[PDB]
Amino acid sequence: PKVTWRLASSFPKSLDTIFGGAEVLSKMLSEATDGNFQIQVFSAGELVPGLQAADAVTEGTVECCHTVGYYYWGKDPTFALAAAVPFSLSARGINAWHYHGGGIDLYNEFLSQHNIVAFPGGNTGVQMGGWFRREINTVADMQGLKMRVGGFAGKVMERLGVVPQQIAGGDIYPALEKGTIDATEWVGPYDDEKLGFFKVAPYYYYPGWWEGGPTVHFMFNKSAYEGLTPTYQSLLRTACHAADANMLQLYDWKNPTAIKSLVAQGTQLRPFSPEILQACFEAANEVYAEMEASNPAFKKIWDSIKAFRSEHYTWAQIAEYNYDTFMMVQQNAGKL
Amino acid sequence: VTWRLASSFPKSLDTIFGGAEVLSKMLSEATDGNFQIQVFSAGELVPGLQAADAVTEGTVECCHTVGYYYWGKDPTFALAAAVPFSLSARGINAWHYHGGGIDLYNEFLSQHNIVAFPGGNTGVQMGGWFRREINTVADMQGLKMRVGGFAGKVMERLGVVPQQIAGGDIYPALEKGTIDATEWVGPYDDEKLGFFKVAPYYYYPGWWEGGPTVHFMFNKSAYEGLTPTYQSLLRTACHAADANMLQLYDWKNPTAIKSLVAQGTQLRPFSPEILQACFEAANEVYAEMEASNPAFKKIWDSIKAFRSEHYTWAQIAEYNYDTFMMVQQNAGKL
């Protein structure tokens, strides 16, 4: 049957892989229905501002959006849990929980009151730790750090004396160039290379512990979703599931070429030290303790994630870790 | 559209066999029953190991199988499924969907009347169940192991003597001491066989299968006779089902390994010496195949081109993040 919807993306077209997930979903649905199930994609600001995409869905302004749940953490930190919070699961672990651990239903139980039904719509994999003008090696090096970063990541780092900066995307490069900020988040090698941060902030840190496996949800107006035939509800879920895998796979394909290119252009890769990672982890757990004690919805979902998190990281160190470690050791020896 | 799908798998291998049921449900629901793929377990339509042969010959429209089952016909069949020391699941999927891998494999399969798309991944498989521990290459000399395919060919060069044993006859063989070890799959499936009762040393990793994909293979004429609409729907649903199986294993395996250890299973890593020896032996086998088989060389070279890039990048953000979480788990901090 003919369905004609609008999708408001939180993302600009220049974030091609993330924005592209909505295009992929739209194409999947159109093609599978000989053009009948139409979702017209719009990029950030075209219909509504990117950070208000979910609000538009709730209000019935548009039928759906493609967004990251953590954009709405200010309304309720529970929005962040199924997207990404610091020191959560990486992509395969979160996906196991989403699809087979009851995570999609748990998140939808929370979202019902907000007039939304959501399904995973991509994963970026572990993000990078950002672009730095000067090295940081110790916790003390973080004192008074001016970093363009926000949300959860920012809340955690504030416990360690960093002050998050609010700066428009296009204003970051000149701020780094002038020395007005010390560091910036962005995404990962494929997206970051285009911004040329390496020219003015050469140290590229990792891992972005605030986003170990962030899911980019498709969120649907609850009335609109419920009005679909069972056939289209099923197709929609199938297509979201495929699109979700597709984005991760695209990043997994593109990122290796991009990191090589960045290093070839003089980028200085640097791990966050064990001391820094341990401090950030401790700070994050302090924040979660407060939230769990004050917010029952948050506690329910986070306890569910944590239950699987310990099991996942027990198993992952057996076959997966040992296989991959062996391959990496071969690679470092020039043997691949 | 009413099609029959011959599975290579028995229903008791529920998560692998189940992939076909998942695809069938996705297609039926999305079309209100108009695109019906009827799923048959191993031996119901044709013998399980002849599933792709039946597709090639057009006796059935499609199958759900593992490419390396047909490595006897041409070792190229195995490459997009799993060969030793290839990519793990995210790496191979990157190559499949965005590295031209699906197209490269289909270019090979065209002569065999098949169009194939990934239909699941199991993630890294285990190294098998052993009556006695092994630590060195010397320890492998004369080892009677139930294993075949590439893995058997490689280990044979190191002195193991591969055994050809039906799934159902493995437990009794271990019980009676007629064999020393067996491979099977991983914790979820392996637990159901109760190998910990007779051969409790559970080795890892199964380096022969880092990220095995289980393909749907469709008769090319059958596929080309679908409307472009159903062709596209079929690709979308395969892509979803492929993710679904990996996600099921990633969910189930943590529970199974805990249960196995609780019941006395002794986890043991293959030593650096053993792994390196297997890696060198595998490269020797590849060098032989590449020199004699242009089709094999073309696809393997493509996988290897990405393999080195992948293992450069994966060791940065992904490995550092995950290893930090593992350390925290081990410290009781999660």
Author numbering:
A (entry chain B): 30 to 365
B (entry chain A): 32 to 365
Task: Give the text the authors published on this PDB structure.
The structure of the selenomethionine-labeled protein in its native form was first solved by the MAD method and then refined to 2.0 Å resolution with an R-factor of 17.9% (Rfree = 20.5%). For the pyruvate complex all the residues fall in the favored region of the Ramachandran plot whereas in the native one, Trp215 and Val216 are outliers. Our data show that the unliganded TakP was crystallized in the open configuration. This does not exclude the possibility that a more stable closed form might exist in solution, but it makes this hypothesis less likely. First, there is a 14° rigid body rotation of domain II (rotation was calculated using the DYNDOM program). Indeed, superimposition of the liganded and unliganded structures results in a r.m.s. deviation of 1.6Å for 334 Cα positions, a value that is an average of a high r.m.s. deviation measured for domain II (3.3Å for 89 Cα positions) and a rather low value for the rest of the molecule, comprising domain I, the clamp and the swapped helix (0.6Å for 245 Cα positions). The dimerization interface is not modified by the open/closed transition, i.e. the intermolecular hydrogen bonds and salt bridges are conserved. Since the residues responsible for the binding of the substrate belong almost exclusively to domain II, the proximity of the two domains in the apo state may facilitate the substrate-induced closing.
This study reveals a key role for an ion in the attachment mode of the substrate, as well as an unexpected dimerization largely mediated by a helix swapping.
